[PDB]
Ligand binder design. Structure first.
Ligand SMILES: [Ca+2]
Ligand SMILES: [Ca+2]
Ligand SMILES: [Cl-]
Ligand SMILES: [Cl-]
Ligand SMILES: [Cl-]
Ligand SMILES: [Cl-]
Ligand SMILES: [Cl-]
Ligand SMILES: [Cl-]
Ligand SMILES: [Cl-]
Ligand SMILES: [Cl-]
Ligand SMILES: [Cl-]
Ligand code: NA
Lengths: 353, 352
């Protein structure tokens, strides 16, 4: 295989290549070798491929028509490492997911349903489902509009994304330790998985305010060591095995809001300070805000009602999460805004094997 | 039918050209008005945006470049080639300089698009470089009449091997300046140290690295942090701009500052190039032609090859670049490679 049809899209704040599953090799070794060559990996500059020399622009979506009930398309996310000959499918990316809906409609995997088309997506990495609402004026996708997200210039068509079946998707339960709060290394934390395994703790409990600049936190070795020691100590409690070399759980340091939101966060993913917050991590953090007695509930401003908009402040702005909660208190769905844009469509080429 | 009514588009081939990357267009496929063309190309790349997240640029000037190619009507020329730099974090598209790396993709692009017919197993493509008025001849491997990008050729800064693209340069004397020696005399002296103002494809100031207080072997960070050195050579550049017929070069990127030193790794010359303020990782393709041509001040340190076809290996930080000169300088040939990465249609949000 020396080529494959491919669409290059921006999905959220990430970028990568979108493939039909039938257009990629069935053998995972042959597939990974093809995608590495497509990106130009391994190479810190990715000069001989389509990767942008950054993990956020070295990503792949594998999309196929789904035989699952109620699901339109299956979606496999793959991170193509920039400077290593490694392609991984552990954990799912909620930004590349934003392009899956429009891509499936454009490719004919899902018929457009009027001027606005809802696409039910099965996320194969963690077995959860997202429903993306795509603008399809006159029966064809558009990527233009008045919606904006932090980290992307200008405005685009909105892609509301509703997540369900998120609780314990990676850890097997919403609270894998069975506790709303666990004391780890002398500090109270919440171990929670509502779409993305997270450790939620007060920024003040680890010696910062939680409003520091991303670059200042990224260079705070003492803080990173304290957080990492906690992350290693809860890997088994969260049913994640040995998390030494894993990118999970994400470390979420929370603080009361300062820009009008519900809560403020600084996220380490697990080592680098995030410029915003992960889309699935936002669902976990927002859900943690609703658990009484937890560090997030202590600092969050939670509105009343069955439908709560939880604006999560992060270094470059805020990401709002709409939580639908039953009369008992359980989060039945979470909806967040993303956008996408088809950038180039055609065929990617690699040198033959 | 079933197209985005709020976007525009054009056919485009994304290629690696040498150590650069960008989009290759047919001239007829872009808007004819400069302003409309520039807005389109900025949107193609996702500029302005330091991350270029909403476009095809790679958040680096070297991966935010454009080639505009068309069938030429100049005598002896196959295609005309306009190089355009799409700025990453500014709403700027410029044609002021000539990239000899994006040039490597032009030949194969022209053949794949049918601008030039394949003449057997190797195809010679005469390329008029409209930015500077120079002519380059690229020899493209076309086995069975089809362009190939696979082969045993290697260049520093690119992993693996690819099909060789030998690129011979003609009409390089005074590409940006009046003639080969813009000042009029060969070895002039500015601020006390002897230099050589020479333009044989890229306007340069050639001078001995010892005459400026360094050895010529330091690393990129150690030279770019050297405020003493950069200030000394910048004052040399700011005092030769009008003398090299370049106007006021305070805001320009030309001429390139070339600090020469004897070779260490077995090459011909070691050079440190400031382009004009950043320490160049390797060396510019056209800059290497000007430096190889400079070899009395450059002859101080040069182990010049012997025969009539000299392979001058110019040692730069990340390795070496070899410039074949035939002798009076007859031709200047350098090795490049290219690869077609993606082919299809690029899309932009409509301007309004
Ligand atoms: Ca329109
Ligand atoms: Ca249009
Ligand atoms: Cl498929
Ligand atoms: Cl990486
Ligand atoms: Cl995500
Ligand atoms: Cl910040
Ligand atoms: Cl990390
Ligand atoms: Cl044309
Ligand atoms: Cl730039
Ligand atoms: Cl060049
Ligand atoms: Cl510079
Ligand atoms: Na279409």
């Amino acid at each position: 295989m020396d080529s494959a049809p491919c669409m290059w899209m921006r999905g959220g704040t990430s970028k990568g290549g979108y493939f039909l599953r039938a257009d990629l090799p069935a053998d995972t070794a042959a597939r990974d070798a093809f995608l590495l060559a497509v990106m130009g990996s391994p190479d810190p500059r990715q000069i001989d491929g389509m990767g942008g020399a950054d993990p956020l622009t070295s990503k792949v979506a594998v999309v196929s028509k789904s035989e699952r009930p109620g699901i339109d398309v299956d979606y496999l996310f793959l991170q193509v490492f920039v400077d290593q000959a490694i392609v991984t499918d552990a954990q799912n990316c909620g930004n590349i997911l934003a392009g899956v809906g429009p891509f499936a409609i454009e490719r004919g995997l899902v018929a457009a349903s009027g001027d606005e088309t809802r696409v039910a997506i099965f996320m194969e990495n963690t077995g959860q489902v997202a429903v993306a609402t795509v603008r399809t004026p006159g029966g064809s996708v558009t990527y233009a509009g008045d919606a904006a997200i932090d980290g992307v210039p200008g405005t685009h068509a909105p892609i509301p994304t509703e997540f369900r079946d998120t609780a314990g998707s990676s850890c097997g339960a919403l609270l894998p330790s069975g506790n709303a709060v666990d004391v780890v290394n002398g500090l109270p934390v919440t171990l929670i998985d509502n779409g993305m395994p997270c450790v939620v703790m007060k920024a003040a409990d680890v010696g910062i305010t939680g409003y520091e600049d991303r670059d200042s936190l990224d260079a705070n070795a003492e803080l990173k060591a304290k957080i990492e020691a906690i992350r290693l100590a809860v890997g088994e409690l969260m049913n994640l095995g040995d998390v030494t070399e894993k990118s999970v759980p994400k470390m979420m340091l929370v603080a009361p809001p300062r820009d009008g939101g519900a809560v403020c966060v600084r996220s380490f993913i697990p080592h680098r300070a995030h410029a915003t917050i992960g889309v699935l991590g936002a669902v976990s953090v927002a859900t943690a805000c609703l658990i009484p007695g937890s560090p997030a509930a202590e600092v969050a401003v939670v509105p009343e009602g069955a439908r709560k908009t939880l604006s999560i402040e992060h270094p470059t702005g805020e990401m709002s999460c709409v939580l639908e909660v039953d009369d008992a208190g359980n989060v039945v769905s979470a909806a967040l805004l993303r956008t996408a844009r088809k950038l180039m469509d055609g065929v990617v080429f690699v040198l033959e094997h």
